[PDB]
Each structure stands twice: as structure tokens, then as C-alpha cells.
Amino acid sequence: MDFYYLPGSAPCRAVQMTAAAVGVELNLKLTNLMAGEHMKPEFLKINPQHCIPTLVDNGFALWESRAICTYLAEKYGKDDKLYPKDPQKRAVVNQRLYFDMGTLYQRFADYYYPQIFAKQPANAENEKKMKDAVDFLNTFLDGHKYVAGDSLTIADLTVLATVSTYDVAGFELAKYPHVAAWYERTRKEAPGAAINEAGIEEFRKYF
Amino acid sequence: MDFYYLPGSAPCRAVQMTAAAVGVELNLKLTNLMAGEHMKPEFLKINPQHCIPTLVDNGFALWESRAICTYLAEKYGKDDKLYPKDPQKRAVVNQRLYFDMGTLYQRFADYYYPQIFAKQPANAENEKKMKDAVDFLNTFLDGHKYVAGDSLTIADLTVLATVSTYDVAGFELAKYPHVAAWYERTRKEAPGAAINEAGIEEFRKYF
Ligand SMILES: N[C@@H](CCC(=O)N[C@@H](CS)C(=O)NCC(=O)O)C(=O)O
Numbered sequence: 299m300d301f302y303y304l305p306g307s308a309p310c311r312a313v314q315m316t317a318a319a320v321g322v323e324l325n326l327k328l329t330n331l332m333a334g335e336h337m338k339p340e341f342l343k344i345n346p347q348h349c350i351p352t353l354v355d356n357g358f359a360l361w362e363s364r365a366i367c368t369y370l371a372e373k374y375g376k377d378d379k380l381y382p383k384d385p386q387k388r389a390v391v392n393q394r395l396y397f398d399m400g401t402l403y404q405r406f407a408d409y410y411y412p413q414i415f416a417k418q419p420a421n422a423e424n425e426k427k428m429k430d431a432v433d434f435l436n437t438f439l440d441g442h443k444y445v446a447g448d449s450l451t452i453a454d455l456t457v458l459a460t461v462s463t464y465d466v467a468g469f470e471l472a473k474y475p476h477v478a479a480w481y482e483r484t485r486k487e488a489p490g491a492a493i494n495e496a497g498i499e500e501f502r503k504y505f
Numbered sequence: 506m507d508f509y510y511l512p513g514s515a516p517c518r519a520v521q522m523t524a525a526a527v528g529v530e531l532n533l534k535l536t537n538l539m540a541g542e543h544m545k546p547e548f549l550k551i552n553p554q555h556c557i558p559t560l561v562d563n564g565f566a567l568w569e570s571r572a573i574c575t576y577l578a579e580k581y582g583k584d585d586k587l588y589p590k591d592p593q594k595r596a597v598v599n600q601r602l603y604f605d606m607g608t609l610y611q612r613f614a615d616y617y618y619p620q621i622f623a624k625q626p627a628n629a630e631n632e633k634k635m636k637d638a639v640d641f642l643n644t645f646l647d648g649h650k651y652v653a654g655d656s657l658t659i660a661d662l663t664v665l666a667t668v669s670t671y672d673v674a675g676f677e678l679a680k681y682p683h684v685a686a687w688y689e690r691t692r693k694e695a696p697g698a699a700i701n702e703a704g705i706e707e708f709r710k711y712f
């Protein structure tokens with residue numbers, strides 16, 4: 299299966315760790331957006347939204363990092379813990395996946411991207427929204443050892459990719475006890491952790 | 506099961522149509538955000554992210570509309586077509602769910618809400634991104650009759666909740682033939698269609 303990605307990308311790193319978790323080997327396809335490789339006619343045929351990560355598994359094209367992670371868990375995973383079949387348990391996992399996309403990473407991007415690509419001054423309003431997002435995550439972790447329960451799931455993997463990004467950007471995770479502790483634990487227990495660590499160094503080249 | 510909602514809210518309507526599709530009755534609990542009812546202690550105890558929709562099913566509290574929709578489908582659904590178990594088919598539906606949230610609705614909200622509620626000037630670039638989101642959906646709908654595959658799924662229901670809102674907001678959907686055709690067909694066929702139409706009228710009360 300081909301994996302169109304960029305090493306420093308969080309959504310890409312989330313899939314990489316999930317693939318490691320289920321023992322699936324990804325045929326890496328470095329896709330340089332600055333060379334318009336995602337806009338090649340061949341790529342558009344695979345993914346009209348022309349975005350990475352994009353996975354192609356024996357003719358089946360799929361994008362949206364979290365959808366890819368769930369796909370790999372359902373089709374190639376054997377350990378129910380990573381993505382529980384029980385509706386209730388799976389629902390908490392799914393809610394956290396949406397949280398990661400629409401709240402945690404979304405606010406991170408809203409605050410840092412303008413400073414990185416537009417050279418705009420740090421926006422106070424968006425800084426607080428980002429802070430509120432980590433606060434939520436901190437609350438989600440109160441009591442439980444993992445983001446969506448008591449066992450490592452793909453929700454921890456995608457949130458790790460995101461939080462490891464907050465880290466390299468210089469965000470103060472230490473002011474969120476549960477997040478900081480979970481991060482330290484998960485950064486050492488996540489399958490493919492070494493790939494994630496190598497990847498953030500590429501993202502670091504943005505600051 | 507309790508359903509904390511507001512009729513005009515798109516994410517809430519997505520859950521209402523999904524519930525109707527699976528024969529699940531929802532005890533409606535109007536939660537007026539303008540009156541700050543989403544921050545009442547009792548509600549924060551159930552949902553610390555203080556957002557609607559929030560579902561409580563025999564003690565189990567859940568938020569994030571699309572996670573509620575899939576939960577209702579997995580636990581109470583009996584028509585595999587609504588949310589296919591096959592990993593690949595499921596993956597296509599799931600990618601569309603993330604599309605609906607992170608691309609289609611996200612851009613709609615970022616463009617209109619700051620104007621309607623915060624009374625801020627329109628943001629031209631955000632308008633452009635919004636057009637790009639509908640364009641993507643238009644392409645997805647080229648050939649394919651439903652948002653995901655050749656049958657109505659929960660992806661059609663949430664996209665209807667989102668697109669119907671684009672409609673009342675005055676966005677020119679007509680310029681996207683495949684989106685417009687799909688909408689013309691689905692706004693009638695969809696389970697809970699009448700609920701959604703009534704809900705958008707309550708949303709209109711903001712224009
Ligand atoms: N929500 C998506 C985000 C995908 C995304 O933002 N992709 C970026 C790379 S970080 C991209 O390909 N941008 C170029 C484009 O969309 O044309 C996911 O989780 O996969």
C-alpha cells in the first residue's frame with residue numbers, strides 16, 4: 299500500500315504510528331507540496347481533494363488521517379483495545395478523534411500557522427482558544443490513563459502526533475499536568491514512536 | 506435518552522435525522538446557548554466541553570455530533586447500508602464524516618458565524634475556502650449518487666444537516682450542479698427530513 303505523506307505532518311505521523319501498531323508496512327511516497335506534487339493529474343485521480351496523507355491499498359484510495367487510522371485498525375488490527383468493537387467504548391474513541399481534528403489541532407493551526415506562513419504577530423484571541431483546547435484535553439485525562447479510556451487506542455496515537463507538534467512549537471505543556479504526564483508516558487509506549495520523533499524534527503524546521 | 510440541543514444547530518439536526526433513521530426516540534432538552542444554559546454546573550458535569558449536541562443514553566454521556574450518529578448506527582441500527590461494516594465501505598463513509606466536519610462545515614462556520622453572532626466583517630479568504638469545500642463535495646458527487654457509495658448513509662445525513670444550513674445562509678449552491686441535485690433529492694428522501702427543514706427555519710431567525 300502506498301502512503302503519500304510528509305514526515306513532519308501530524309496527520310501523517312498519526313497514520314505512521316497506527317501502521318506500526320498493526321504491523322502494516324507502508325510504501326512511502328514523499329509528496330513535496332512546494333513542488334506541487336499533490337496537484338499532479340495522476341494524484342488528483344487518486345484524491346480529488348489533493349491532500350496528504352493519502353493511502354492507496356490495492357486500488358482503494360483513502361484520505362483523512364483519522365479515517366485512515368481507523369481503517370488500518372479495523373482491517374489489519376487484531377487487538378480490540380486499539381479500536382474497541384463495543385459501541386460505547388468506540389464512541390468515546392471516535393469523539394476524541396473528532397476533538398483532535400476540530401479542537402486540539404484546529405486551534406493549534408489557527409494560532410501558529412499565521413505566525414509561521416504569514417509572519418503575523420501572535421494573536422491573543424487565538425492563543426486563549428488554543429489554551430482552552432489543551433485545558434479540555436487535560437480534563438479528559440483526569441482519572442483515566444489514556445485519552446479515551448484505560449487502554450492505548452488510535453485516539454492516543456493521533457493525539458500524540460498533535461501534542462508532539464505543540465511541543466516542538468514551544469507550547470508550555472507543563473501547565474497542564476494530566477496532558478504532560480500522558481504525553482511523557484505515550485511518547486514511550488506508542489508503536490512507531492521513533493518515526494514520530496524523527497518526523498517532528500522536520501516540522502521543527504518551521505520555527 | 507436525553508438530547509441536549511437547539512433546533513437550528515446543524516450538528517444537532519445531524520443526530521436527529523440519524524435517530525429517526527434508526528427508530529431511536531430522543532427526549533428533547535432545549536439548551537439555549539444565548540442564555541448560557543450549556544454552562545450550568547449539571548451540564549458541565551456531563552459534558553466538560555459544554556457543547557451541543559450532547560447525548561446521554563442510560564448514564565453514558567457523549568458529544569461530537571458525528572460520533573453520536575455513528576454510535577446510534579452501530580448500537581441501534583439494523584440496516585448495514587446506513588453505516589456499512591465492511592472496512593473499505595466503512596472507511597469511505599468515515600472519510601466523508603471528517604470531510605463534513607473539518608472541511609465543509611468548519612469553513613461554513615468560520616465564515617458566517619463571526620458575522621451573524623459577532624457582527625464582524627466578512628472574511629474574503631474564508632469565503633474562498635468555503636467555495637473550495639463545496640467544490641470538493643461537488644466532485645465527490647460527480648458520478649456517485651450519494652456522499653459515500655451508492656446508498657444513503659449517515660454521511661448523507663450529516664452533509665444534509667450542513668448543506669441545508671449553507672442554503673438558508675444564502676450561499677449559492679446552484680452553481681454546483683452535483684451538490685444541488687443531491688440536495689434536491691436528499692432533502693426529501695432523508696429520514697427526519699421534516700425535522701431538518703423545521704430546524705433550518707429556526708436557524709433562519711438569525712438572518
Ligand atoms: N483533516 C485532514 C487534514 C489534511 C491536511 O491538512 N493536509 C495538508 C498537509 S498537512 C495538505 O495536503 N495540504 C494541501 C492541500 O490540501 O491541497 C487529515 O487529518 O488528513
Ligand SMILES: N[C@@H](CCC(=O)N[C@@H](CS)C(=O)NCC(=O)O)C(=O)O
Pocket residue numbers: 396400514515516538543554555556557558568569570571606
Ligand atoms: N464538532 C462538533 C461541533 C459542536 C458545536 O459547534 N456546538 C455549538 C452549537 S452549533 C456549541 O455548543 N457551542 C457553544 C460551546 O461550544 O460552548 C459537533 O459536530 O458536535
